[PDB]
Structure 1
Amino acid sequence: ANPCCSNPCQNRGECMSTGFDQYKCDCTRTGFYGENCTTPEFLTRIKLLLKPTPNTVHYILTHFKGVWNIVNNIPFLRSLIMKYVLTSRSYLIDSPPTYNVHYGYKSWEAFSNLSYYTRALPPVADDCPTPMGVKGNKELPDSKEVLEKVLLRREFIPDPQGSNMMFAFFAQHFTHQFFKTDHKRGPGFTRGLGHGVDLNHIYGETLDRQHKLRLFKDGKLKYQVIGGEVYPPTVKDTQVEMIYPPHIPENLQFAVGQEVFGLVPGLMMYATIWLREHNRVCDILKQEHPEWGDEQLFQTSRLILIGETIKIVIEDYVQHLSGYHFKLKFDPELLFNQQFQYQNRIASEFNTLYHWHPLLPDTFNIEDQEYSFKQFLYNNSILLEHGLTQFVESFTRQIAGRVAGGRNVPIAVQAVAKASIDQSREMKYQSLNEYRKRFSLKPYTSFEELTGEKEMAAELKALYSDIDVMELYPALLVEKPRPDAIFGETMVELGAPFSLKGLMGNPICSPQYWKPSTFGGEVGFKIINTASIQSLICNNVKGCPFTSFNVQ
């Protein structure tokens, strides 16, 4: 009965009720006017007419390899293009943040309470007649129905971009510092109060936890040596709380910043590499600063590791994801003459579309073994038996699954995929096409346009009837991918703004932080500005095995 239930305001105008059965659209600064903010202003007609489609742009970025080769080798030109990449979409992220699961209007509670994920689109009001607002049936289609017909893997569909398990586990490890749902409160709540790349998954969310992980000598983190190899300490040594099944022996209860990282040895692998990396930087900083104490060595190392992470995510991780020939660049100075907010609030929808479980293989292939999920989960003895070098060599070779294109979620984690559907609904997510409009994309006009094929589309059309009732999460997983790409348009276009905002919004990218002395001088600064996935593994994994985010 809320008069705004039909989402009547277009072009990011805001709907407000003006009585029981009337509404008003606030078209302030949308570029549009009129009752529903649908009449474009003159300057808006022009730019709309001159704006290429995302699929047109994606074509240009993935072709003309020779032209892009020239651009990359002209620092001024590459800088200019990367600068546009960073600012072109800032208008798409509300910063400071606005809505959350409990607030469809702006409020001081929504702005100030950091325990919420923020929301790119307000929730559908509780009293709306249908889950998507006014369209569709009283209830959305059975989520198990949707799961089985279009989401579950039949046969493994490999990623055509060649993502490997180093990438898959890097994505899982990296994202689990800011996707940390507080299930004691609900799916719209997080425990990552830093709301970004603070490396709490290495150092701990709280000071108490951090101090239990620290050696308090030379800035270093505690560690144990097993078979000549450095691994994280135990729960017994540190008193750090970790999530482990009751049968895990004490000497295998490794303690790391993130309490769930004992769930899979792929995560413990990266937890071990980054712990080693922190202590390596401690040695470097102590050599440069014999006069420094333990506290300053730890803090400066932490700042450098934050920088390395952002460097790797942009220039290796996103670079791989994009398939662009243009070489992305981590350069905070590109924003110094630009309007940009050095802050971030993690959006629920960003969490939702980062649910890349189709990446997971049917078995995890380390050396000559092929572990099933049951053997793999919560089993750190695999990491000790094979070691990090063999983990890297094996995971560099093993292909990851395709995420878009449908029917590639391994049934081992079908409960998680069903929870993504159920809890998206619980959080009153708007429809896929509302989210498409919110990120300047054309609404899909049929299920076949969404999938690009006929069979999944037909199953989805029988379940949903109307395309405007299609839900965001399943749509991402069934969407037609870009040509030979891992993702469809919606994933890239909705996820990229959150992603870059979460990286460039970090305080170390602000002008007063982005200078050598923040990082202990030019030597510490250079560790950030030369980091890579290859060198991260090379400095911290015995034998310096080759690695990358794609197979071969």
Structure 2
Amino acid sequence: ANPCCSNPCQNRGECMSTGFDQYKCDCTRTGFYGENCTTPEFLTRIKLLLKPTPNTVHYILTHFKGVWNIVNNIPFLRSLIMKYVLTSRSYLIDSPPTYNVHYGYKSWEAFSNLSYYTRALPPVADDCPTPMGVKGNKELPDSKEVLEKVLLRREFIPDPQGSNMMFAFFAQHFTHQFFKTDHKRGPGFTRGLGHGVDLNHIYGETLDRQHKLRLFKDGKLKYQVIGGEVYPPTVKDTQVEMIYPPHIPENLQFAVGQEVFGLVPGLMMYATIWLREHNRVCDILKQEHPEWGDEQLFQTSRLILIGETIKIVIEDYVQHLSGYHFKLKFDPELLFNQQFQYQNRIASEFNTLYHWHPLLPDTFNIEDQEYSFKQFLYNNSILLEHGLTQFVESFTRQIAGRVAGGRNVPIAVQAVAKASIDQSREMKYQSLNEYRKRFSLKPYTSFEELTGEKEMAAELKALYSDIDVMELYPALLVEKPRPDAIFGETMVELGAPFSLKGLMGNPICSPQYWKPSTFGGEVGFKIINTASIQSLICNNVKGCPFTSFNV
């Protein structure tokens, strides 16, 4: 019924109903004009030719290794390139934010209510004839069919980039601070009202939860010592709410910032490391500031660990993931002379993009064991038996699964994968091609172009019929990867602007915050600017074992 159901407005033009069967496109500042914002202005047509494809840019960044080696050691050049990466990506994101699951038009409710995930593309209206608008059948294909035909893992496909379990568990730990779905309200809602890197997965979302986790001396967090090793305190001791089955022994009911980190020993591993890191920084700051109280030591440590997290995410985590030969740099100063909004709202699609279910291995190899999923879930005793040292060494060696390329989702989490499809439809996501156009990508013209092969493409075609009806989430997993890479084009071009906007959008990246005195002097500041995934383990893991995000 809604005339905007076909998504007629192109090039990020805004559709508005002007009657019962009439619409108008707002091409304001789109660089286009006309009824559908399809007719390019003069300067627009020029930029369209000079601007290369994402695959071309990706190729350059992943080749000419010797050339980039020169670039990386030239500060002025490295800064200029990183600056371009930051600016060009962030312009894809609406900031301040616009739509959510309940509003396909802008409203104060959609802007002010922080309980919502925001939306890069508005939902398909309720009165639309088809789930994707007007294209496709009355109903999308069976989610179970799609899951089994092109998603479920037949044989474990390893990651050509060699991402290890240290990478996988960092990804889940890191992103669990801003993807906290409020299942009470629905998939379009979040409990992470901070909408970014606040480290609530360490310090708790609320003040009362924080205060229960704090020692209230020397700025430190509460902890217990088992076998000489520092671990998070217990539920019984702190009285913070954690999610554990009732049979878990008291000393194994670890109390941490995120209530679900007791689900996975891998998550509790990083939880322990960051806990130790916080208290380590507390020791450092106190030595520098013996005149400081417990409150200032705690708050200053937190700001430092926020910095450390962002530093590691960019220069180690993303650096590995991208496959670039360019040395990515975390440097807030790059944006000081640029137009940039220091704020962020977590996008529902970014949560969807991050559903990297194929990442998970068949078994979790630790030391000389090979635990299954049923053995791994809610079993922190594995963490205590082997210790952090053994965990780091084991997880650095074990390879993870390939996300794109189709047919690699372990059946142990098939219910979760199916839910990603269902909840995407429930939230009325637009199609793959509409999201591709939203991020300046060419729409696929066939399922074979999408997957790069014939077998899976044929199964998809029998299911969806029209390529313009292909869903975003399943496509991400079946997409034709980049040459010897973990991801396809769509995963990167969509996720990277969500990511960098959330990293650099942090208030500690703003010029008033990005000062040494903010972090307790040059000593605190250096901890941030020298942070790495290696030093974090070296500075929290016994014996200081080697580690990286690849095998």
User: Normalized against structure 2, the TM-score is what?
Assistant: 1.00
Following TM superposition, by how much is the alpha carbon of 1:249 offset from its aligned partner in structure 2, in angstroms? 1.4
Determine if contact 2:90/2:498 at 8 Å carries over to the other structure. Answer: no
What number of residue pairs does the alignment pair up?
Answer: 551
Following TM superposition, by how much is the alpha carbon of 1:250 offset from its aligned partner in structure 2, in angstroms? 1.6
Deviations 1:199-256 (A, max 9, x none): 0000000000000000000000000000000000010000000011122112111010
| CA distance in 2 between partners of 1:247 and 1:346 (Å) | 36
| CA distance in 1 between partners of 2:251 and 2:309 (Å) | 29
Deviations 1:100-149 (A, max 9, x none): 00000000000000000000000000000000000000000000000000
Aligned residue for 1:271?
Answer: 271
| CA distance in 1 between partners of 2:91 and 2:524 (Å) | 34
| CA distance in 2 between partners of 1:222 and 1:357 (Å) | 33
Following TM superposition, by how much is the alpha carbon of 1:91 offset from its aligned partner in structure 2, in angstroms? 2.1
Deviations 1:45-75 (A, max 9, x none): 0100111100111110000000000000000
2:365 alignment partner, SS class: strand
| CA distance in 2 between partners of 1:56 and 1:191 (Å) | 39
| CA distance in 2 between partners of 1:120 and 1:302 (Å) | 30
2:15 alignment partner, SS class: strand
Q: Stretches of 4+ moved more than 2 A in 1?
A: none
1:474 alignment partner, SS class: helix
| Identity of matched residues, % | 100
Aligned residue for 1:200?
Answer: 200
| CA distance in 2 between partners of 1:297 and 1:85 (Å) | 35
Determine if contact 2:436/2:443 at 8 Å carries over to the other structure. Answer: yes
| CA distance in 2 between partners of 1:359 and 1:327 (Å) | 25
| CA distance in 2 between partners of 1:143 and 1:279 (Å) | 46
Determine if contact 2:262/2:378 at 8 Å carries over to the other structure. Answer: yes
| CA distance in 2 between partners of 1:50 and 1:105 (Å) | 33
Following TM superposition, by how much is the alpha carbon of 1:411 offset from its aligned partner in structure 2, in angstroms? 0.6
Aligned residue for 1:5?
Answer: 5
| CA distance in 2 between partners of 1:438 and 1:421 (Å) | 20
| CA distance in 2 between partners of 1:410 and 1:216 (Å) | 44
1:226-375 equivalences under 5 Å are 226-375=226-375
Deviations 1:507-536 (A, max 9, x none): 000000000000000000000000000000
Following TM superposition, by how much is the alpha carbon of 1:89 offset from its aligned partner in structure 2, in angstroms? 2.2
Determine if contact 2:265/2:382 at 8 Å carries over to the other structure. Answer: yes
2:539 alignment partner, SS class: helix
Following TM superposition, by how much is the alpha carbon of 1:357 offset from its aligned partner in structure 2, in angstroms? 1.4
2:84 alignment partner, SS class: helix
| CA distance in 2 between partners of 1:283 and 1:378 (Å) | 32
Deviations 1:163-195 (A, max 9, x none): 000000000000000000000000000000000
1:217 alignment partner, SS class: coil
Aligned residue for 1:91?
Answer: 91
Following TM superposition, by how much is the alpha carbon of 1:468 offset from its aligned partner in structure 2, in angstroms? 0.1
2:91 alignment partner, SS class: helix
Aligned residue for 1:62?
Answer: 62
Deviations 1:23-43 (A, max 9, x none): 000000000000000000010
| CA distance in 2 between partners of 1:515 and 1:108 (Å) | 34
Determine if contact 2:89/2:500 at 8 Å carries over to the other structure. Answer: no
| CA distance in 1 between partners of 2:193 and 2:187 (Å) | 15
2:425 alignment partner, SS class: helix
Determine if contact 2:90/2:500 at 8 Å carries over to the other structure. Answer: no
| CA distance in 2 between partners of 1:299 and 1:93 (Å) | 30
- Mark the runs of 5 or more structure 2 residues left unpaired by the alignment: none
User: Normalized against structure 1, the TM-score is what?
Assistant: 1.00
| CA distance in 1 between partners of 2:413 and 2:362 (Å) | 11
Determine if contact 2:25/2:35 at 8 Å carries over to the other structure. Answer: yes
Aligned residue for 2:101?
Answer: 101
| CA distance in 2 between partners of 1:31 and 1:248 (Å) | 60
Structure 2 residue 417 is matched with structure 1 residue 417? yes
2:247 alignment partner, SS class: coil
1:88 alignment partner, SS class: helix
| CA distance in 1 between partners of 2:502 and 2:485 (Å) | 24
2:230 alignment partner, SS class: strand
Determine if contact 2:342/2:510 at 8 Å carries over to the other structure. Answer: yes
| CA distance in 2 between partners of 1:103 and 1:57 (Å) | 35
Deviations 1:265-320 (A, max 9, x none): 00000000000000000000000000000000000000000000000000000000
| CA distance in 2 between partners of 1:112 and 1:435 (Å) | 25
| CA distance in 1 between partners of 2:504 and 2:314 (Å) | 10
Determine if contact 2:507/2:513 at 8 Å carries over to the other structure. Answer: yes
Following TM superposition, by how much is the alpha carbon of 1:90 offset from its aligned partner in structure 2, in angstroms? 2.3
- Mark the runs of 5 or more structure 1 residues left unpaired by the alignment: none
